[PDB]
Design a protein around this nucleic acid. Structure first.
Ligand SMILES: Nc1ncnc2c1ncn2[C@H]1C[C@H](O)[C@@H](COP(=O)(O)NP(=O)(O)OP(=O)(O)O)O1
Ligand SMILES: [Mg+2]
Ligand SMILES: [Mg+2]
Length: 430
DNA sequence: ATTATGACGCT
DNA sequence: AGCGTCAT
């Protein structure tokens, strides 16, 4: 009763750009705007591999990982923008720089955690407290929440046939039920968080041209889940009270970290399908199947409770360059391996020198990873060496020295390499 | 031949 | 340190 935590202590948002690489290309090329469009990498094999898809193109069934030639069968008028190629490889610099634009705007509002190139978590607890104090007892107008969905609403008892009418009816029920004179009300705190996130999203769109979606809840897992509920160009508030019904039909795999083998094991060992079904197990039972850490996490998460903090980190902690060499193109000679290590190392040096100038830090460790032909894993081997100078020839020579004894017999390289990966790690202030 | 590349856990 | 998992 009075001592059971409810996981309502924080306001956390997850902001995620809508079809991000597509919007970057559409801002640059107005002919692509408001059209079925996708971003592709590498044209020669099957038209290239799609890595981002506009919502207009998704309506035809175009998806990430599809070959462009196959996407064109579903959507003959599909427009395509190609990732830049430099030194024989895809180069993602344009999208990293667009990401920095968005992250720098978000960081004006609150401390962010960079979770991917196109999304960040926001800890809004302090910002909400401040807004609630300057705005004491004032009601919250629906006009301050023009793109917000309240998950689970409307419920109960004609315009509720179009989606915007449903959105507003749900929002009206929520606001009509708020206790606005209670500064410690979790529901009120989430609502003010949503007001701030509307402002944040308006600033992003105003200052970059890019649209995004967002989730607002009490922790990162619920904010991430909420964000996807009403994409694109909308934000969703998931309250603590909404959790039982939301989770009652929510496949386990939809919760972040449960989309792989662990979630599969939860389903198979417990014989359940939905996140809410987890409430019927004791914490010790869950720890017995999934380990102490996972068991405690699952016990809390199925009740809507999670404590993982929004880490104060706007910048990536590693800077890496990778290229696959599939099928017949696998690297089979020592000259080949050395040339591609140099290409990767030259891109890496460019990115590292810029990083040192921008961010006052230097990487101190170089990690080299390879995949051997026939291995299913993303890395067949990983070895590190010191990164003492931002020099591409030195980095590539060192990488070759750490991996060269993976070569069983030469001039020749066997078995052939199907992936090379260089990663700079262990940054220190400079 | 689903690529480029991020974070973090385990031992 | 090096491998495994999960993610966009
Ligand atoms: N598996 C992958 N491989 C390569 N690039 C990828 C990728 N997944 C995503 N990207 C790149 C390309 C993506 O544009 C970007 C962000 O990924 P999302 O946030 O998962 N998806 P998006 O923003 O496109 O659409 P929306 O969020 O509206 O559903 O990262
Ligand atoms: Mg996105
Ligand atoms: Mg994303």
């Amino acid at each position: 009763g009075p001592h059971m935590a409810t996981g309502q202590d924080r306001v956390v948002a997850l902001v995620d750009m809508d079809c991000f690489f597509v919007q970057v290309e559409q801002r640059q090329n107005p002919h692509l705007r408001n059209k079925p469009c996708a971003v592709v990498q590498y044209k020669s094999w099957k038209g290239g591999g799609i890595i981002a898809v506009s919502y207009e193109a998704r309506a035809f069934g175009v998806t990430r990982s599809m070959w462009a030639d196959d996407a064109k069968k579903l959507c003959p008028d599909l427009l395509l923008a190609q990732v830049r190629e430099s030194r024989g490889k895809a180069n993602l610099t344009k999208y990293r720089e667009a990401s920095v634009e968005v992250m720098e705007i978000m960081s004006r509002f609150a401390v962010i955690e960079r979770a991917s190139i196109d999304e960040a978590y926001v800890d809004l607890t302090s910002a909400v407290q401040e807004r609630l104090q300057k705005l004491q007892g004032q009601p919250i107008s629906a006009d301050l929440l023009p793109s917000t969905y309240i998950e689970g609403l409307p419920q109960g008892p004609e315009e509720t046939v179009q989606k915007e009418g449903m959105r507003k009816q749900g929002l009206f029920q929520w606001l009509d039920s708020l206790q606005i004179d209670n500064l410690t009300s979790p529901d009120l705190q989430l609502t003010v968080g949503a007001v701030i996130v509307e402002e944040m999203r308006a600033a992003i769109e105003r200052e970059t041209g890019f649209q995004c979606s967002a989730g607002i809840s009490h922790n990162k897992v619920l904010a991430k889940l909420a964000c996807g509920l009403n994409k694109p160009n909308r934000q969703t508030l998931v309250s603590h009270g909404s959790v039982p019904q939301l989770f009652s039909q929510m496949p386990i795999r939809k919760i972040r970290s449960l989309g792989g083998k662990l979630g599969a094991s939860v389903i198979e060992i417990l014989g359940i399908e939905y996140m809410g079904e987890l409430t019927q197990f004791t914490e010790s039972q869950l720890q017995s199947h999934f380990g102490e850490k996972n068991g405690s996490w699952l016990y809390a998460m199925c009740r809507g409770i999670e404590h993982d903090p929004v880490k104060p980190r706007q910048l990536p902690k590693t800077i890496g360059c990778s290229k696959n060499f599939p099928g017949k193109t696998a690297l089979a000679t020592r000259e080949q391996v050395q040339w591609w290590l140099l290409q990767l190392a030259q891109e890496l040096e460019e990115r590292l020198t810029k990083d040192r100038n921008d961010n006052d830090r230097v990487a101190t460790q170089l990690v080299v990873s390879i995949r051997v032909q026939g291995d299913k894993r993303l890395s067949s081997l990983r070895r590190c060496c010191a990164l003492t100078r931002y020099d591409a020839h030195k980095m590539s020579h060192d990488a070759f020295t750490v991996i060269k004894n993976c070569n069983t017999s030469g001039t020749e390289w066997s078995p052939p390499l199907t992936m090379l990966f260089l990663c700079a790690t262990k940054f220190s202030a400079s």
